[PDB]
């Protein structure tokens, strides 16, 4: 019980060091093509599994189209964790990024 | 009767995204009650104080919104959750 | 792949090493001594290469 | 909930009428094949597409 707590504290502290604070991220403010593609794919996969939908489906049956509709209106509840080669990372919500 | 604080790595479906705590309860914790558990040591009778460990470390512990890591292949999320189990171990 | 069957674990790294003689003697379910694979009537002979402790073989339940 | 309009018709159309359906995967993983089935059985199966699961273990899952 005590070894696991030490392991958990060590892992959480090592992760906390990796996380770049919100006011120090120096990556591009735009959303890359790969980031947009995977956002759409993951959101569509979620919607396909009865995830709550934050947009009006104008008679649409394609989950990917629902994801694109939500991305147009910036209502996707996802976060991109951009990884630097060192292992340190930055967190950007989809709202903060600007498409194209 | 003993209270044991545990941390479990559990999954979360898309249907429980707006209520992740109730999703963890209805998925992994409710089936765990009234059944002897070998990794605890007795008959789990209840759980209390369920909390989700946030994926971003810089958030507070009082933040209402947290981050859950989505599986690369599936839409399921996975996260660590701490909870105190009330268990009768004979 | 089935998106409704999530996997909770993940392989992060692998490392290479020699398989010591002590461990294989422990993990093994049976050792082979007779260099005849299957006897008459097509049945796999116990202790041979095709042993029911090495896995199910041709509609025979694995002994392990 | 948004899909049953098309998926029901796909199940009815069967495996040999495009657009159609060739298999149904229940929540538990059962793979009901639509190949050797009549139209009436296909309508019975299609009317039971969006039926909520009776099992707690798969209550987060839907058919495919």
């Amino acid at each position: 019980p005590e070894d696991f707590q030490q392991h958990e504290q060590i892992r959480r502290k090592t992760l906390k060091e990796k996380a770049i604070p919100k006011d120090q991220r120096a990556t591009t403010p735009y959303m890359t093509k790969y980031e947009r593609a995977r956002i759409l794919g993951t959101r569509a996969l979620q919607i396909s599994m009865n995830a709550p939908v934050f947009v009006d489906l104008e008679g649409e049956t394609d989950p990917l189209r629902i994801a694109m509709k939500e991305l147009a209106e910036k209502k996707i509840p996802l976060v991109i964790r951009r990884y630097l080669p060192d292992g340190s990372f930055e967190d950007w919500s989809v709202e903060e990024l600007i498409v194209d | 009767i003993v209270r044991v604080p545990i941390a479990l790595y559990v999954s979360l479906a898309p249907m429980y995204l707006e209520n992740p705590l109730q999703g963890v309860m209805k998925q992994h914790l409710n089936p765990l009650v009234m059944k002897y558990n070998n990794k605890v040591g007795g008959v789990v009778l209840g759980y209390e104080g369920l909390k989700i460990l946030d994926a971003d470390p810089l958030s507070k512990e009082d933040t209402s919104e947290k981050l859950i890591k989505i599986t690369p292949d599936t839409p399921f999320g996975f996260t660590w959750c701490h909870v105190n189990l009330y268990v009768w171990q004979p | 792949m089935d998106i409704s069957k999530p996997v909770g674990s993940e392989i992060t790294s692998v490392d290479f090493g020699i398989l010591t003689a002590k461990e294989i003697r422990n993990l093994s379910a049976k050792q082979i001594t007779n260099p005849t694979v299957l006897d008459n009537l097509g049945h796999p002979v116990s202790g041979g290469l095709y042993d029911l402790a090495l896995g199910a073989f041709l509609r025979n339940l694995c002994s392990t | 909930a948004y899909n049953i309009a098309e998926l029901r018709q796909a199940v009815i159309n069967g495996p040999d009428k495009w657009p159609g359906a060739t298999q149904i995967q229940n929540e538990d993983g059962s793979l009901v094949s639509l190949i050797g089935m009549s139209v009436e059985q296909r309508k019975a199966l299609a009317n039971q597409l969006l039926t909520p699961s009776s099992n707690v273990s798969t209550h987060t899952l839907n058919k495919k």
Partner: peptide
């Protein structure tokens, strides 16, 4: 039964029983 949608992937004890 015994699925990642039912049982925890890993369960560890944090503190000693109390």
């Amino acid at each position: 039964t015994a699925t990642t949608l039912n049982t925890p992937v890993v369960i560890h004890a944090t503190q000693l029983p109390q």
